[PDB]
Amino acid sequence: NAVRETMDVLLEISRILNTGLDMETLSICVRLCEQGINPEALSSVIKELRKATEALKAAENMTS
Amino acid sequence: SEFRIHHDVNELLSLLRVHGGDGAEVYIDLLQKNRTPYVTTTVSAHSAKVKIAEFSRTPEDFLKKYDELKSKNTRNLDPLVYLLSKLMEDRETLQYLQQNAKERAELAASAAASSGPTWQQSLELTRKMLRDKQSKKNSGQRLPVLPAWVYERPALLGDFLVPIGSLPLASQEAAVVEDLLYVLVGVDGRYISAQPLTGRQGRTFLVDPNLDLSIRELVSRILPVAASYSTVTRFIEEKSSFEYGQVNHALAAAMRTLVKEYLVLVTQLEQLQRQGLLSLQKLWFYIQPAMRSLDILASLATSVDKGECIGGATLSLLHDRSFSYTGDSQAQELCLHLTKAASTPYFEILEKWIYRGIIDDPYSEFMVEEHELRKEKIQEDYNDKYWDQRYTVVQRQIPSFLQKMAGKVLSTGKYLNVVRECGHDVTCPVAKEVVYTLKERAYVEQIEKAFSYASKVLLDFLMGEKELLAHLRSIKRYFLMDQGDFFVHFMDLTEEELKKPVDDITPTRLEALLELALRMSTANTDPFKDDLKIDLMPHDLITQLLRVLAIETQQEKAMVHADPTELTLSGLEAFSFDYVVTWPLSLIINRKALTRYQMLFRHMFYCKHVERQLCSVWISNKAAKRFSLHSAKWFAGAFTLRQRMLNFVQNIQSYMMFEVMEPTWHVLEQNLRSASNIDDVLGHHASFLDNCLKDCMLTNPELLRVFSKLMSVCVMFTNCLQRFTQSMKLDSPQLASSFEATITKFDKNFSAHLLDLLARLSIYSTSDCEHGMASVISRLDFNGFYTERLERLSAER
Amino acid sequence: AEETELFELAQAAGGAEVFKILVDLLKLNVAPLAVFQMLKSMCAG
Amino acid sequence: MASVPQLLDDLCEALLPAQRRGSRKRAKQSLKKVAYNALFTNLFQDRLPVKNRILMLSFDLRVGGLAAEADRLEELVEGLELGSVLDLLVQLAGSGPPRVLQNVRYGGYDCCHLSGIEADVRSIISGEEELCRDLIRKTLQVMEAAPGTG
């Protein structure tokens, strides 16, 4: 419950930051950070993957 | 039922006037191993239809019915059509059937003479009948049915319910376009009219006389799609009925979604129409794009309605259509889309049934429907259904793709409904979204994992909540002792109750004796004792066992239907045992299965009591060693008789103890260890039961009667010995009349009965060979001193 | 049951005994080969 | 905690909203491959106090007329006082859509500032309603001249 509450507070902060980050992404990021993943690497990969997902979504919308 | 051949095929032999030959009994046997829950009729049905029409003397009705029977879209018309064609092939078979039938037809005839389509009405009858049918299926529930006001407001969808005498050809085309656009919007034409649908129809057009012959011909193409669209709106409303179904509602809504496309194209053309820049040929060009699509859409709707497709009826029709809509690649994909969507209307419940282990049956679309079956009454009932009818299977309701896995799906759903009846209702973690897709093997692919998970969960729950290991480590003490103290107290305490006749037995005293014997042993490590008790039968173990062995064999009414009330209530054979386990907690022992597991106790304890009586006679016969038994003519022939009868009874018990016992018991242990499903555990237990009773040899009425006669001779000999002891030790009437050293004659009779029993064992080892019969012969021929004489009497045939 | 539809199929056959015991065998989904052998045997009697 | 590829695939599929079902599988595989390529690039290629960074973010909000939102975020941060997760979220901050629309007076404390704020809010509400109406109208008008079958 402590991890869940911490994740909820972090998600609230991120929503205040207007990041549009998911709770599942938050949990995955918590696991990566405890695993020793660079916050900069995680955020850069997140931005690149968000851009790729947006491009794929646009392409599939034109691909319907 | 499973013996429905008796009702159909046996009466086929009798009533068909075919008593010679095999009749339709061997035909019943032929169709029995050829009758499947599903259908595998893949065949060139066109070829079979051609053959039938070729042999059809009046092929008009043959071809007409070849179309008409598909109107209802009934169950497996292809097999009947093939039968009707192939039977016309054999005139000899046809003529022989004519002999079998026409003569009976003449007999019956002689015995006889001695002594228009309104869409409104056709849909209202359907709606009322479907409301009644949904009420019957509800069996005491309400319905989210369409309202009476929904039926009211006629033309609730706003349904489709000009002088052109000398119009210029262009103005005529424009006015005709206006009329046709109104018709496409379900409105009246300008110079022409359109009668309403003649029941199942759109609008039966009435072309204007002033409409040019060329104009009328061009409009003729439009009118098809117009009637199609009107009937399509009507069919969408029909599927919108809750009686049609929530899935039918989903299909109708998907159609409405495409119907928006229809009105969209209407407005797209209306753009040029308001612009006045359209043309009759231009319109025909634009209509061709989807004029065919209009009729294509109405096609599947008419298929569902004409088949009254409820449940997997419309699903199968849809899947078949999707498999055939090729060529019309647009319809090949559109029907696939509709299939994939509307699967979820049932596939969610299917997922619910499959995944959630709880099938939602507001409409009972899933073939598995949780049929009412009280699992509690299974154990105490000789015939039970809950283990097999806690979830009935509606074979009539199945989708096209679903029908393949349905049997495997039936097993998986049965396991899931078992998990639901286990209290711990649960969703299978495999929740592969049930939906329609082209991959049919994929439908069963995740189904395989789901069924495996269901079976594994069932196995784990049985190893948990059921915990049958203790239910058997304790039942080992039940009906088999497996410990001297297990049944030692029962033997030591039931003596007085059995001495009291069955009419003379005191149930309260028996209850007290049972409770005390329950506390009288240190083998109470088994915790399942409360699940077990004692009981009694108003008939001897023989009184019903031999009646069944002579199953209308020789005493259908002489002894099997003869009530035990013809005899008296005897304490020993009337006795019985009691035990039970809850519905979820192993209601396995139904009174038939429970009786099968119980009566081994009766037979074993009968032999135990006989051996106890023999041992008591011998222990009381401890004084005769202090002198010469030669002076005990009424008490020393007892020694010879005891020697001759120990081989008959005590030695007969050893074959059951080792040869009979180890096989069935070890088979049950090993098979249960290999058991993974409920069926596997049932097989292990069924081995332990059937094979054990087989080595008990308690199912051959003649041989069992011979063994019973030997045991009864032994019992009567023990009783006569006890009576002679009572009349002699008190001598230091009836008991003295039992024997006066005539117990020597009784021992001779026992030896003769033993010779007969050895002959029965030899008969088993000769006509059936076997190993148990060869062992019975081997135990009889221990030494020739009482076996070489038996061998000679065996040759005395 | 569909006794009416069975009679409809029989009139479609247009022969000369509802014969729906065979339709019961169809409900059991008996095989055409055993069905043909059984029909020949029942014809012979 | 999962394998780097396993968690990468989970997160990629989470961002991925996934024509053929083979196409959907290929899209998921492409998302996983792109994530793997990005992670490999980051690995092959391979500051401010977090309190200072949060202070800068709250200062940006309060300067951006979000002094209340800065206070809410500062309360969340003070409750917090994972740091790498905070930095990653800060990098993703603003990648959600920017938010454009969401004892007593001393006698002289009455202000037309509040009155104008309320008037602007009401005008914005009316403008939003009119804009929604106009946008729906534009969508319908663009559809009005089209064929209709796709």
Automatic annotation (TrEMBL), chain A:
Subcellular localization: Cytoplasm, Cytoskeleton, Microtubule organizing center
Keyword Glycoprotein: no
Any Gene Ontology biological process: gamma-tubulin complex localization
Keyword vocabulary terms for this entry: Cytoplasm, Cytoskeleton
Cellular component, GO, one term: spindle
Family designation: Belongs to the MOZART1 family.
Protein name: Mitotic spindle organizing protein 1
Shown stretch of the complete protein: 16 to 79 of 79
From TrEMBL, chain B:
Residues covered by the Gamma tubulin complex component C-terminal domain: 468-786
Keyword field contains Cytoplasm: yes
Main location: cytoplasm
Gene Ontology CC, one term: centrosome
Domain Gamma tubulin complex component protein N-terminal residue range list: 177-465
Subcellular location: Cytoplasm, Cytoskeleton, Microtubule organizing center, Centrosome
GO biological process, one term: neuron migration
UniProt cross-references to Pfam families, sorted A to Z: GCP_C_terminal, GCP_N_terminal
Keyword terms: Cytoplasm, Cytoskeleton, Microtubule
Gene Ontology MF annotations: gamma-tubulin binding
Domain of life: Eukaryota
Biological role: Component of the gamma-tubulin ring complex (gTuRC) which mediates microtubule nucleation. The gTuRC regulates the minus-end nucleation of alpha-beta tubulin heterodimers that grow into microtubule protafilaments, a critical step in centrosome duplication and spindle formation. Plays a role in neuronal migration.
Family, per entry: Belongs to the TUBGCP family.
Oligomeric form and interacting partners: Component of the gamma-tubulin ring complex (gTuRC) consisting of TUBGCP2, TUBGCP3, TUBGCP4, TUBGCP5 and TUBGCP6 and gamma-tubulin TUBG1 or TUBG2. TUBGCP2, TUBGCP3, TUBGCP4, TUBGCP5 and TUBGCP6 assemble in a 5:5:2:1:1 stoichiometry; each is associated with a gamma-tubulin, thereby arranging 14 gamma-tubulins in a helical manner. Gamma-tubulin at the first position is blocked by TUBGCP3 at the last position, allowing 13 protafilaments to grow into a microtubule.
Protein name listed in UniProt: Gamma-tubulin complex component
The organism of origin for this protein: Sus scrofa (Pig)
Gene giving rise to this polypeptide: TUBGCP2
From TrEMBL, chain C:
Protein name: Mitotic-spindle organizing protein 2A isoform X4
Organism: Sus scrofa (Pig)
Gene: LOC100153925
Region of the whole protein represented: 33 to 80 of 155
Stated family: Belongs to the MOZART2 family.
Subcellular location: Cytoplasm, Cytoskeleton, Microtubule organizing center, Centrosome; Cytoplasm, Cytoskeleton, Spindle
Automatic annotation (TrEMBL), chain D:
Domain of life: Eukaryota
Cellular location(s): Cytoplasm, Cytoskeleton, Microtubule organizing center, Centrosome
Record text on subunit structure and interactions: Component of the gamma-tubulin ring complex (gTuRC) consisting of TUBGCP2, TUBGCP3, TUBGCP4, TUBGCP5 and TUBGCP6 and gamma-tubulin TUBG1 or TUBG2. TUBGCP2, TUBGCP3, TUBGCP4, TUBGCP5 and TUBGCP6 assemble in a 5:5:2:1:1 stoichiometry; each is associated with a gamma-tubulin, thereby arranging 14 gamma-tubulins in a helical manner. Gamma-tubulin at the first position is blocked by TUBGCP3 at the last position, allowing 13 protafilaments to grow into a microtubule.
Function summary: Component of the gamma-tubulin ring complex (gTuRC) which mediates microtubule nucleation. The gTuRC regulates the minus-end nucleation of alpha-beta tubulin heterodimers that grow into microtubule protafilaments, a critical step in centrosome duplication and spindle formation.
Annotated family: Belongs to the TUBGCP family.
Name recorded for this polypeptide: Gamma-tubulin complex component 6
Species of provenance: Sus scrofa (Pig)
Residue numbers of the full-length protein present here: 1 to 189 of 1715
